[PDB]
Amino acid sequence: SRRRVVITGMGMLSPLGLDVPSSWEGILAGRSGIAPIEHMDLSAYSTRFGGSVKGFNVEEYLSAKEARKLDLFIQYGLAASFQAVRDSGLEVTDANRERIGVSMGSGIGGLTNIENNCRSLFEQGPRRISPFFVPGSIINMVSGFLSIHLGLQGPNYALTTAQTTGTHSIGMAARNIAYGEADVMVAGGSEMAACGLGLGGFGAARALSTRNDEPTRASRPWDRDRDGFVLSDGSGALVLEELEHARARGARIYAELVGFGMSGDAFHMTAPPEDGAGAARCMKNALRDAGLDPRQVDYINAHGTSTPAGDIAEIAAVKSVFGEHAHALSMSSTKSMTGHLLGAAGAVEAIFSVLALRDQVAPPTINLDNPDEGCDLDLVAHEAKPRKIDVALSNSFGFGGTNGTLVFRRFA
Amino acid sequence: SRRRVVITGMGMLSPLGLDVPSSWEGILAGRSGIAPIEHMDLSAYSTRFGGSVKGFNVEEYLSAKEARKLDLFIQYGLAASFQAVRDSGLEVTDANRERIGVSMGSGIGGLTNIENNCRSLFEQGPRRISPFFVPGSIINMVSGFLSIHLGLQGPNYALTTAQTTGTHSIGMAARNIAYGEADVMVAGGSEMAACGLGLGGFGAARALSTRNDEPTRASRPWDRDRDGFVLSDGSGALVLEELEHARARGARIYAELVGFGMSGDAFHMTAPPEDGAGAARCMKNALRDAGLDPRQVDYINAHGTSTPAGDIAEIAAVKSVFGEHAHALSMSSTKSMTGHLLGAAGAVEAIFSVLALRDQVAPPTINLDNPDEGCDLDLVAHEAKPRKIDVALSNSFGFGGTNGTLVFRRFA
Ligand SMILES: C1CN(Cc2nc(C3CC3)no2)CCO1
Ligand SMILES: C1CN(Cc2nc(C3CC3)no2)CCO1
Structure with a gap:
């Protein structure tokens, strides 16, 4: 077992x-x-x-x-x-x-x-x-x-x-x-x-x-x-x-x-769907895999690539998965600072997710001066936010409509 | 379960x-x-x-x-x-x-x-x-x-x-x-x-x-x-x-x-160990995964790449895994006919292994005119050999000492 x-x-x-x-x-x-x-x-x-x-x-x-x-x-x-x-x-x-x-x-x-x-x-x-x-x-x-x-x-x-x-x-x-x-x-x-x-x-x-x-x-x-x-x-x-x-x-x-969740968009070779349907399927697979109430999620390390379509798809996926709790969790893109390490993005971001749990801090999304239409969640704009984090989620999306989610939590 | x-x-x-x-x-x-x-x-x-x-x-x-x-x-x-x-x-x-x-x-x-x-x-x-x-x-x-x-x-x-x-x-x-x-x-x-x-x-x-x-x-x-x-x-x-x-x-x-068996040689970047200790662990792992005794194996679709070191390592590996049954199984390299399809080699060879089970026939190792020192197994030289095949293995060994074995069995 x-x-x-x-x-x-x-x-x-x-x-x-x-x-x-x-x-x-x-x-x-x-x-x-x-x-x-x-x-x-x-x-x-x-x-x-x-x-x-x-x-x-x-x-x-x-x-x-x-x-x-x-x-x-x-x-x-x-x-x-x-x-x-x-x-x-x-x-x-x-x-x-x-x-x-x-x-x-x-x-x-x-x-x-x-x-x-x-x-x-x-x-x-x-x-x-x-x-x-x-x-x-x-x-x-x-x-x-x-x-x-x-x-x-x-x-x-x-x-x-x-x-x-x-x-x-x-x-x-x-x-x-x-x-x-x-x-x-x-x-x-x-x-x-x-x-x-x-x-x-x-x-x-x-x-x-x-x-x-x-x-x-x-x-x-x-x-x-x-x-x-x-x-x-x-x-x-x-x-x-x-x-x-x-x-x-x-x-x-x-x-x-x-x-751990995976899902395929089955949408487009390179573009994510606007509604974040595949990302939402992936996060739900991962939360059910972890035996969690979605309201237990405190922090999401977003894929957050700084593309027009990718970024808005992710807000939509998070809103669809977490409903009203989407306004209580913190979501940030460390890609604001590191850029996009492609094949390595998920690996460095899993490490930032674990450290977010160790240090009880949500890393910032830097350069978030004018949030776009509908990007009205706690995106930790500009500055690191000390906060309670028991459960952290790391998302990745890629070409071929390929989605991954990892769910980490504190151990004691 | x-x-x-x-x-x-x-x-x-x-x-x-x-x-x-x-x-x-x-x-x-x-x-x-x-x-x-x-x-x-x-x-x-x-x-x-x-x-x-x-x-x-x-x-x-x-x-x-x-x-x-x-x-x-x-x-x-x-x-x-x-x-x-x-x-x-x-x-x-x-x-x-x-x-x-x-x-x-x-x-x-x-x-x-x-x-x-x-x-x-x-x-x-x-x-x-x-x-x-x-x-x-x-x-x-x-x-x-x-x-x-x-x-x-x-x-x-x-x-x-x-x-x-x-x-x-x-x-x-x-x-x-x-x-x-x-x-x-x-x-x-x-x-x-x-x-x-x-x-x-x-x-x-x-x-x-x-x-x-x-x-x-x-x-x-x-x-x-x-x-x-x-x-x-x-x-x-x-x-x-x-x-x-x-x-x-x-x-x-x-x-x-x-x-299904996996193993790493942890030996060399491109060459297998002479005794095929890696391929032996991988095959043993695959038979354990299937709950099968080595004695039950009838047919092996070899990696059989036609490299000096690779071919002889696989003989050592089969003799080690199978002992007094190593001569009773048939083992052939379909690469004698197809050549080495690299990343596709294991896919077409899994298909050939499945069809060997359907048609009760070991495919030939063509061009096996003068078996090398120690190459005394049933390698199905020159011509197809009809026989009893209940269990078939397909082996792949690659750069990095990465090994794969699949075990297939007749269904009814
Ligand atoms: C992750 C990053 N990958 C890197 C990459 N590959 C290419 C060209 C050869 C195809 N340029 O950059 C692309 C896949 O996504
Ligand atoms: C099976 C085939 N693999 C792919 C391959 N890479 C190359 C050159 C670019 C380096 N030629 O083929 C290499 C070995 O594994």
Whole structure:
């Protein structure tokens, strides 16, 4: 029968920090991680800024010899995973290594690497493609390389569900533990899509904010002057652990993961439905999975991408699910500060959701100067709000009409 | 406790045929689908051949306009999925659409699309990138587009576990049904990595057969003259269904999915351990999942990629798991005929395993002229072998040491 799942370790790279604590300090202080991109010439692009990881030192984690072989998304994924495992205090042994797995996901994985090897192929020919190109670029190699370095012989896999990837990765890893397929899972996601193909591709779809002259104000979820999402890089990893296994070894437990929902919109390849029907189905699945009265929800970390259609869909979904209680809970988008980490958005946001529970504080939606038509909930505009939070919900939506919800609550 | 999962529909594109029965006919006749790759200049490449899908007409499935938006891997995935759903006779209704989900995966996804947009990007800059570039290229758009086209509102996700994708997709879908998260899932994988970056990428790692003079002899699993895998394209989709749901509507049931195993080697990024300790744990895990003794297994559809290290690891793994029954089971690599469909390998091989149960026949390992040192099992050399098959295993082992086993059993 179904076992309980707790969070015993967390790790992160974000535009606000090279770990969880430094990232969280920025979240609570309403700091923006968004800046003109310096690694390349974006003068031909309609968007020239995003959320870069600043000062990442791969030699805190990996040999320069291994690092050279791996795309930044894999480097970021491993850094976050190592942080999480260290933070858990878990010791891997011959006694438990078959029961510890990994589910670290990505939207596109090694797009920089693919672009660079494409450049080689077109300018020089196939003989200049790296021998490390495939294992260094494909999405499942965070899971792969992590398992190799730590000796994890449990379930080893990777999700790719676009902007929903991190939430799905965490939820399904929890199910692995819940149903007895593993006792421990490292789960989350990593993204580094800030190359010509990523900024170009989202640019061609007009999905990105073009506020090049004021990048820290670009990401403004529910604000009437929003004009698309801000592209950001990084990684979130959590150590998920069966409750009795955590109690047995004396683990510090951050919070309990009580609920997971998925649903398909079955609406459109890229646009969410205006009424938030699929998002509402997903949150209800998750609240029923957690055995909760919806009025128990104190805080929602919204998907909150700063797109016109996405942001209003979410208000509509929240109003439909929570009715009058929609006015009592706090909902915020940390994407106001971090931008949109795509495959990693759900993973960093699950971590902010857990910290919202630890510190009893709703992070702000910065840049929310003029809430749009119908965006009349407590959206924690401008400044962090200390408040009672027993239950926190993290939403993600993505291309293909793919929805995820995670429900966390305090553990004592 | 757990619900029972059966297979009520199958769909396929392979190097042998544009559907399951035509592909299966090729398999039982020992036909090769491998040939020099056409309409692509491979002069500068060490490998010039592969398993291509021949005569695929996407307009049987999609309008020309919707096909132009989608990478070939997505087209192939949708073809297999639409075949599988039509094969099942399932009627999607408002009453059941929330209970029907999709998990169609890929190893890379849209390399061909990415390669052609790199061309535009380097030659002309970002302004020639298609607006449909991102949604037309990302791995979760087979699940996305299928869900939208058929109105499927159940769990909607995509796996990417390299050469293990198809096996994990089917296994995890089976779990969704077993634990009551869905009543029906369309599951499997698709792949089209026959571009410069795919042939070039694998070529640079020297992973491919370079037997350009005799492409149909290139794929020769456990033969002493094998020299790497053969890159192939295509798709497999299965309709997985809870047993009482299949029986209520009078579905034709091909077989029962009784077991699913996952394991990580935690060994090497691309090579398996020589003893196949990983594949052995995964098979043992799948038999335990099915409540079956190794003695009950009759037929194994091997990973059998025709790589020196992979083929011999699988022999060690089978001898270890099965002991004094290892010679009594038949084990064949259909990759001897199809080549390696990468993320789709496990999907088309699950279908071949199901059909082996229906037709009571072990497909051949063609080109097994001179079994290697230790390759003394019943590998079904050269020709199909009619026999008693009650239980069939399908193995997948991939980059990152990610392993998958499915266990199928006759139904009645
Ligand atoms: C999550 C982020 N993903 C990243 C991405 N992929 C692309 C191009 C190659 C298709 N540009 O950026 C897209 C899916 O959603
Ligand atoms: C099964 C196929 N996988 C996908 C793949 N990626 C590549 C090049 C871009 C790196 N070619 O194919 C890799 C291994 O798993």
